[PDB]
Design a protein around this ligand. Sequence first.
Ligand SMILES: CNCc1ccc(-c2cc3cc(F)cc(C(N)=O)c3o2)cc1
Ligand SMILES: CNCc1ccc(-c2cc3cc(F)cc(C(N)=O)c3o2)cc1
Ligand SMILES: CNCc1ccc(-c2cc3cc(F)cc(C(N)=O)c3o2)cc1
Lengths: 147, 147, 147
Amino acid sequence: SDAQEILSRLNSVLEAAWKTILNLASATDAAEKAYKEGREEDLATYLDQAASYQSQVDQYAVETVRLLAELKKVFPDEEADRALQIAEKLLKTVQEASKTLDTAVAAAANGDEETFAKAFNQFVSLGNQADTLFTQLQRTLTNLNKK
Amino acid sequence: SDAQEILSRLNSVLEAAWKTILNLASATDAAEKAYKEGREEDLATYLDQAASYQSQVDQYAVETVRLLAELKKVFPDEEADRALQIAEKLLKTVQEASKTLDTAVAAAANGDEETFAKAFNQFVSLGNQADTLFTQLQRTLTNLNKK
Amino acid sequence: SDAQEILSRLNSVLEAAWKTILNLASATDAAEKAYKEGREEDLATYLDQAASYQSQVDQYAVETVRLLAELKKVFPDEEADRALQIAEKLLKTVQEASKTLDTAVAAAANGDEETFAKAFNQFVSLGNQADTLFTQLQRTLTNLNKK
Ligand SMILES: CNCc1ccc(-c2cc3cc(F)cc(C(N)=O)c3o2)cc1
Ligand SMILES: CNCc1ccc(-c2cc3cc(F)cc(C(N)=O)c3o2)cc1
Ligand SMILES: CNCc1ccc(-c2cc3cc(F)cc(C(N)=O)c3o2)cc1
């Protein structure tokens, strides 16, 4: 059916997103280490890398919202309705993480440790919020792949 | 002169290689964390990322040898001889790191932890040896770029 | 089921690997022609292409082992054991080819043809050994799939 193609694309998107999230986590940890070690050029590179993966996560979140809305049209189900609401909250949260990472990038560029520390801490907290949303989404998708 | 262009290309290669090495370091640290935490699927992702960066380092290390070989050909004396010798030892070490990382990746996929740990720890040690040569090469090239 | 997902991903990986293997074979033949003709810059280009394709084959071979390892966990039988054993031997052989190509690429960059030619011919032999295992694995997966 159409529903099966959409679910297959969703599965591929969430698989790719999970890899990107791992890359984002690695870059973020490397930025934390460079920050603690006072290696400003390393920190700049790793913030740029984190931002790149963050932008990709943002795009996977967009694509997930789009695909779930498509699924609701061709295969109505309160579970797909549920996944879409989670996916939309995830999209809001990753965008908020991007904004805070951008603040951290600008603060590092300006050499403004006080703004940097607040922004970087908020980024980490938003990442955790989003990871919690991502896991709910994965389990809703599993409950959808078995219907 | 041909020499100016070559030294220029070399500085660009080494700057790109340094970025890649930072990515390889972040992925290696993330693999170590996944390994400690027993998160096998995460470890697989990070090992694949490390292998991809390591392949890119290998390519840059090849290009560096080729460029220094070319620079030596536009020299009537043994001036670039030492830079080339360093770069060839760097390449040898980088390729040993690559082989050893491959052994680690296979051992992880095979679920052979004894082999994995031995190879992963060897890879880390080869990376530090390679880093010593990389920095030595950069210093030698500064002493050539003055003209 | 999980089984059918794994088997479909495996079929896709092996189809992609087969194309990469064809690309590797063509680059290897082009490198041999450039070597015989004495065109060192062409040889460098083709060796770099070969190395890139080889790194991709290495990754697909790792993915194939991981997928068959997963399948054996879900159905612990002899056919799953057989397929995994073949895939692990394929991976070993591919990594041996990869290390041998590394030796050849470095020798060509170092201007050491005696080492290059020996290693290049070793690489070709290992590639043909890997092809034997690759076709054996395809035959084993027919017994695992159509079922
Ligand atoms: C601070 N320790 C490293 C770290 C950093 C970020 C995250 C993380 C997970 C995650 C899951 C998502 F679905 C979205 C994001 C995001 N930042 O958009 C995530 O970040 C996890 C660990
Ligand atoms: C284990 N802590 C992370 C880590 C990993 C690798 C390296 C490293 C540096 C380096 C420099 C080179 F010139 C080549 C390589 C390489 N592996 O080819 C390097 O690895 C540094 C830190
Ligand atoms: C074109 N005449 C040279 C030649 C012949 C065969 C190959 C070859 C086949 C093959 C199959 C695999 F499954 C893996 C590899 C590899 N090198 O990893 C292969 O290489 C490479 C070069």
